[PDB]
Design goal:
1 chains, alpha/beta, 2 domains, binds adenosine-5'-diphosphate, DNA-binding
DNA sequence: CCAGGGCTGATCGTGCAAAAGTCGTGCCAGCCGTCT
């Protein structure tokens, strides 16, 4: 029941809500999903579901479902008790076996390949996985949480991603709102970042913010968000490179040439 | 004076696979027994 807390940083009255919705499902062991756009602050949330569960005792391995080897998929996922180096006592590890009693994080689910998608399937609800070799398969108790920024329904129409896997996985999908829509925690997010930032670049103390600064930073549709705010602020700050006069200028894109 | 961290050394490991070798049986050439 212990709470990690970390950096909730939400003053949205909709991030509050976001925290509230996930909290109810934290105890739950059902498959879940997390959906975010290019700038959504979702990695913390996957941890905030498992951080808040009874099985908070469990290990929280989270694989990157996009980078696995096509060829080693069978081995990587399951693993083979015989290990290596002959009569060696060292046993093979495994993917799904190394997450019993703890939440498993799957990322880039939409991007995950057809071989991976078919391979998932059949292990999601059955609970039995058999390592290459042998005649015995052992049930694992593993909690599926999936984070994706891509739109699943469109993928289903295309046929690129199997429809059944998506349907079976996550009864409830958490909704994350874009930053242009928070619109409120920027005064707060922006300072927090900048405050960190001052010690990473080794300044003492923030100068302060011009009103204009805040006219620009409110006023913009912020394409691929949050992370975006950090970048707009972190650069702009190191840019300025001092602590006499307050911060006066922020650049949205360091592309434009001048 | 007692507990925590580092580091060295002590310990466990008789097989998998690649190429050379043998195996059995067939194909064909050359000698020899016998009838016409
Ligand atoms: N509520 C928050 N509190 C603190 N930091 C946040 C929050 N939301 C976003 N961030 C910052 O923005 C980044 C979000 O990246 P991430 O969630 O990994 O993107 P994605 O979910 O698209 O992979 C993090 O590195 C984090 O520092």
């Amino acid at each position: 029941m212990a709470e990690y807390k970390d950096n909730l940083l939400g003053e949205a009255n909709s991030f509050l809500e976001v925290l509230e919705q996930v909290s109810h499902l934290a105890p739950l062991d059902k498959p879940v999903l997390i959906i975010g756009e290019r700038g959504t602050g979702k990695e913390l949330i996957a941890s905030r579901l498992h951080y808040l569960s009874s099985r908070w005792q469990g290990p929280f391995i989270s694989l990157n479902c996009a980078a696995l080897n096509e060829n080693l998929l069978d081995s990587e996922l399951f693993g083979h008790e015989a290990g290596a180096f002959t009569g060696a006592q060292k046993r093979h590890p495994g993917r799904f076996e190394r997450a019993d009693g703890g939440t498993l994080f799957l990322d880039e689910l939409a991007t995950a390949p057809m071989m991976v998608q078919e391979k998932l399937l059949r292990v999601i609800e059955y609970g039995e996985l058999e390592r290459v070799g042998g005649s015995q398969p052992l049930q694992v108790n593993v909690r599926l949480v999936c984070a994706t920024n891509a739109d699943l329904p469109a993928m289903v129409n295309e046929g690129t991603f199997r429809a059944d896997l998506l349907d079976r996985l996550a009864f409830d999908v958490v909704q994350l709102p874009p930053l242009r829509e928070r619109e409120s925690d920027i005064m707060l997010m922006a300072e927090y970042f900048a405050i960190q930032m001052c010690r990473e670049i080794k300044l003492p103390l923030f100068p302060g913010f011009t009103e204009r600064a805040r006219e620009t930073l409110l006023n913009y549709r912020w394409p691929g968000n949050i992370r975006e705010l950090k970048n707009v602020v972190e650069r702009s700050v190191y840019r300025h490179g001092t602590s006499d006069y307050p911060l006066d200028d922020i650049i949205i894109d360091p592309f434009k040439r001048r």
